[PDB]
């Protein structure tokens, strides 16, 4: 209804309307972010019907500011409304502080607004799990995983979305400390479609640096994919 608590404590102590929101994330698309010395790479899963549905949906890899990534995973309906609030927030902060919003501040806000929607009355919790890549006040890259419950934490290399457990356990065993520009692409690609089909059209990968977020084009994407199927043989 209008102004009723729809998220309330189950007799065992859990919040059922948040627990169900987590299961809405699992029915999404996997997203992977990898950190490095001074840049972060983000690779996500995209689904397009052949010959139709031009890839202008560009769900994941959302620009927030000059240097702020966002690769959500969950209900695309709630993705736009949550993202647009941050973009509204990012400029307001850059107006009240005259300095671009750091990655940590944006993650704290996204975690705040998400947790706000599971505490107010007559509002459904966001069915979205996001991860943000950006630079702090000091120039230092960071990735901030987020959950629909509002919990957030910084991660070196985290995977969210559909069957993120399999990707995470793989990503945990072969992550180097400071990988190369072409290594981070490979690790993200090798991990993103460990659960996704090996086709190069399914994955969309972009790399974030100190300036001018760069989208990786299909040339090397196809090139590295052909380097992975032979890895699987």
Partner 1 sequence: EYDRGVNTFSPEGRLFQVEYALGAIKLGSTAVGICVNDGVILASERRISSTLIEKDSVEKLLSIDDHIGCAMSGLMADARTLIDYARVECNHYKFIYNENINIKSCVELISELALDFSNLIMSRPFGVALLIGGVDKNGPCLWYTEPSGTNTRFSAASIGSAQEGAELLLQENYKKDMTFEQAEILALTVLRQVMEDKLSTSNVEICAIKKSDQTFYKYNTDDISRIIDVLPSPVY
Partner 2 sequence: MARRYDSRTTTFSPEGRLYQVEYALEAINNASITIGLITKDGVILGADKVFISKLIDKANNYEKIYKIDKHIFCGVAGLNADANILINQSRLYAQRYLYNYNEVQPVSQLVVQICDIKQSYTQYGGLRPYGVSFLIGGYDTKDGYQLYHTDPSGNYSGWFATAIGTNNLTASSVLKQEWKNDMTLEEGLLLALKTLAKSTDTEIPKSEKIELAYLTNKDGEVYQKYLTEKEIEELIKLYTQK
Partner 3 sequence: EYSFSLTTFSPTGKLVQIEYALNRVSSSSPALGIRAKNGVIIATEKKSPNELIEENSIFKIQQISEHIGIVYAGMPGDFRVLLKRARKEAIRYSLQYGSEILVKELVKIIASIVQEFTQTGGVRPFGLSLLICGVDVYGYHLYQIDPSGCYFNWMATCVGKDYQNNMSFLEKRYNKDIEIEDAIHTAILTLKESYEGVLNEKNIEIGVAYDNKPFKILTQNEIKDYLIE
Residues of the shown chain interacting with partner 3 in the complex, contacts defined by CB under 8 A: 1-4, 122
Residues 59-78 contacting partner 2, CB under 8 A: 75-78
Round to whole Å and give the CA distance between 113 and 222.
38
Q: Residue 4 or residue 232: which is nearer to partner 3 going by CB?
A: 4
Tell me the closest approach of the beta carbon of residue 203 to partner 1, in angstroms: 20
Please enumerate in sequence order all residues whose Cβ is within 8 A of that of 50, keeping only pairs 6 or more positions apart, or say none. none
Radius of gyration of the chain (CA): 18
Q: Residue 172 or residue 197: which is nearer to partner 1 going by CB?
A: 172
In the shown chain, the binding pattern of residues 83 to 122 toward partner 2, with x for contact by CB under 8 A and - for none, equals -x-------------------------------------x
Interface residue list for partner 1 (CB under 8 A): 3-5, 7-15, 104, 111-112, 115-116, 119-121, 142, 144, 147, 149-158, 168, 171-172, 175
How many residues form the binding site for partner 2 (CB under 8 A)? 34
Tell me the closest approach of the beta carbon of residue 16 to partner 2, in angstroms: 8
Round to whole Å and give the CA distance between 121 and 89.
23
Tokens representing residue 86 in the block: 């941050």
In the shown chain, the binding pattern of residues 13 to 32 toward partner 2, with x for contact by CB under 8 A and - for none, equals ----x--xxxxxxxx-----
Round to whole Å and give the CA distance between 157 and 229.
23
Please enumerate in sequence order all residues whose Cβ is within 8 A of that of 211, keeping only pairs 6 or more positions apart, or say none. 66, 67
Please enumerate in sequence order all residues whose Cβ is within 8 A of that of 165, keeping only pairs 6 or more positions apart, or say none. none
Tell me the closest approach of the beta carbon of residue 122 to partner 3, in angstroms: 8
Q: Residue 65 or residue 147: which is nearer to partner 1 going by CB?
A: 147
Tell me the closest approach of the beta carbon of residue 95 to partner 1, in angstroms: 21
- Given 11, 13, 50, 231, the residue binding partner 2 (CB under 8 A): 50
Please enumerate in sequence order all residues whose Cβ is within 8 A of that of 15, keeping only pairs 6 or more positions apart, or say none. 7, 8, 9, 118, 149
Round to whole Å and give the CA distance between 213 and 201.
20
8 is a contact residue toward partner 2 (CB under 8 A) = no
Residue 154, strand partner residues: 144
Q: Among candidates 147, 155, 107, 99, which has minimal Cα distance to 127?
A: 147
Query: Would you tell me which residues interact with partner 2 (CB under 8 A)?
Result: 1-2, 4, 6, 17, 20-27, 49-54, 56-57, 75-81, 84, 122-125, 127
């Amino acid at each position: 209804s209008y102004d009723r608590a729809i998220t309330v404590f189950s007799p065992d102590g859990h919040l059922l309307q948040v627990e169900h929101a987590l299961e809405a994330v699992k029915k999404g698309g996997c997203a992977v972010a990898i950190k490095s010395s001074n840049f972060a790479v983000l690779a996500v899963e995209k689904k397009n019907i052949p010959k139709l549905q031009n890839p202008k949906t560009t769900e994941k890899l959302i620009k927030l500011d000059e240097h702020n990534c966002l690769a959500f995973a969950g209900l695309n309906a709630d993705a736009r409304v949550l993202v647009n609030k941050t973009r509204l927030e990012c400029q307001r902060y850059y107006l009240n502080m005259d300095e671009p919003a750091p990655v940590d501040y944006i993650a704290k806000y996204v975690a705040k607004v998400q947790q706000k929607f599971t505490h107010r009355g007559g509002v459904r919790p966001f069915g979205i799990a996001t991860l943000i890549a950006g630079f702090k006040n000091n120039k230092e890259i960071c990735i901030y995983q987020t959950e629909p419950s509002g919990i957030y934490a910084a991660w070196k290399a985290q995977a969210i979305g559909k069957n993120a457990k399999i990707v995470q356990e793989f990503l945990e065993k072969n992550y180097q400390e400071n990988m190369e520009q072409k290594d981070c692409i490979f690790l993200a690609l090798k991990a993103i479609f460990e659960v996704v089909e090996l086709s190069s059209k399914n994955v969309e990968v972009a790399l974030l640096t100190e300036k001018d977020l760069t989208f990786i084009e299909e040339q090397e994407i196809n090139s590295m994919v052909e380097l992975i199927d032979q890895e699987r043989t």
